Symmetry: D2
Subunit: 193 residues, 4 copies
Amino acid sequence: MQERIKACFTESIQTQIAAAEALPDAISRAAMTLVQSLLNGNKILCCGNGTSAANAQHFAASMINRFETERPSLPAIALNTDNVVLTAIANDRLHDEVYAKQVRALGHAGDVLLAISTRGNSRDIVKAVEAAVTRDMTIVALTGYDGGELAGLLGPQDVEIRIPSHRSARIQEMHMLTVNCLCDLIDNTLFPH
Amino acid sequence: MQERIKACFTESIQTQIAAAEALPDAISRAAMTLVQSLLNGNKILCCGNGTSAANAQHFAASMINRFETERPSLPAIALNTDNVVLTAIANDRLHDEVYAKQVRALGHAGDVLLAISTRGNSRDIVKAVEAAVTRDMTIVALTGYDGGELAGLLGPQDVEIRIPSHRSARIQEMHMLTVNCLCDLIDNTLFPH
Amino acid sequence: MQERIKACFTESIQTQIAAAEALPDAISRAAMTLVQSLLNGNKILCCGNGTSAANAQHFAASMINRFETERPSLPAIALNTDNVVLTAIANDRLHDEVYAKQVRALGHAGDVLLAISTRGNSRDIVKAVEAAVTRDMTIVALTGYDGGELAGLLGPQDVEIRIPSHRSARIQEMHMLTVNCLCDLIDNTLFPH
Amino acid sequence: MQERIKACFTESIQTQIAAAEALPDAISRAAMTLVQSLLNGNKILCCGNGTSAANAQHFAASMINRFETERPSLPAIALNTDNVVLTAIANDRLHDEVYAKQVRALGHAGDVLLAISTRGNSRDIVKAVEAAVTRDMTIVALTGYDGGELAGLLGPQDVEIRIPSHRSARIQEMHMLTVNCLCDLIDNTLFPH
């Protein structure tokens, strides 16, 4: 078990070191996008499945409540939290529209869709991006592996932060760190402390 | 048990009959308020605690997904669904602002806050209403008993639908029916045919 | 709008009157089943989609927290609340196993599955019942319309409470009342006040 | 922003390196505790607030659905997911027992309570641990800083995994990694091949 645990931490450390070198520019661009949207009075809609759903909620809470400093609640909403809405939509033929329906209903031009997916192929995530585009929203996608379908649906004004890894557990861990570095940048820019 | 069950249904029926006579006007006014907000491109924020939280989600899902008629998703969000955001806020001295923080962040002038409480005294609901007013939002309050503190915060443009009952179970049931008649009216007014 | 609202309340009142005459025996049996399971130290797993998910949570909260009197927390769990688990399972080919997986993992002989469905045809609900049977659990199904597939999967020791209605909104309202009369019976039998 | 992002990743990496040296033994002990409980037919109750709530759900979903290997659903439940139950409890004077009430109702001797808190002081977490001990449950606590009040409640059979850090963001990231290494061990021990 000891060896296994060490190998676990080592793979993580190696992934983070690889990421620290390759992701700074994308993370900075993503932060600029989020900050500008917020400054313009827009909101951030977030979505993800499974662990990615949890990472989306972590971003939402960091904005709505706080990350590390006392400042006003910032407008961010996770679209993977209302179990009534979710199980009701999935209780249909077009079950992959769970996120798309919410984006179409709530999204406004200037808003940002924070999409989180380890593999980037989930149909509900893809449809959410399609819906965001129909609402003139910008996309920030946290991905892994090869980016999947999601990476191929982003325009020049959108930002992909692809973790350099092909192991879901490591990618999800890196997504949490990514969200945290993003939150640190948002608050340092808008509410330094 | 037979008699008890019959007394249970009897109380419900008597309450519904009393409500049918006294609530149509208020329900109609609330429907007009909700319809007007939606037509103006605004959204409906909803909140409640416990069973009232469930009632809030039912309204949100009926808007976001659908009620009965086939039409586009309407913008409604329940503020009592993101467990990460909620437990994060209630993790400190600020438990009473679980809803207020979300209203501060998301509420825009013209939006509506659908507040649901059987007694109308819960501090977090009172504060959500207070915050909504600060954001130039109209309030539609579903209450019971004497309306509580919530009732005292409403202005000429807000609408209170106070179930004539002093038993939370009956009030909660009447709130679901109320929400359902409101959904029927919203859909009949916006998408008739 | 006034007339529409009145017709809404009238349909509800008529449904409740029809139910008060036809459901007492089934509700009593369901209550006996739930009480006996609890007395034997077992638990109640609950599941439903959409509004039914909300009704399931209402039962869970009434047991875990309280209904109307102060007594110990009773073991009831809604299987439609963990959004991470839900969106992760649905993020697969066997998406209809969202509830079944949880029942197989958590269910023990003697436990009860409280299944709520307006039409009784949802595949995830059907699979949850199949799983409960594999765990020697008893079933209490709150249904509507003709009972759908669900009604045809119940044995002699299981209990179906079929609302005499073919209108989802009315059925869901009646399910809440049914849960409340059930909770009143559970507490009157175990903790009278 | 570039430098800030790099300092962000650097702190994470340094923390992971420190943790790799000091936590293997504790993680191994925790894994053995979790595996033993599961083998005995027991379940794992999980709880946390905010981001720790998200981490708790990740562990629960990895057990209930799956982590990486194809095997049966394992019994784990996060106590911070039913928003109706949570808001119902926190609707009164009893907000600090949101988790304790669930543990009282559901906990059996032999079960394990996976408690997650960066500081280990939150009253609702302390009370959940207190209640778990009352139900003869073993405790696996994921903490940070100095372990807080939580650390002081642990006995010889419980396991504390205290991340060597004084920054909640880093601790939360390390908790996800910790949970992932634990899941890997559980699956390697129970379903190797």
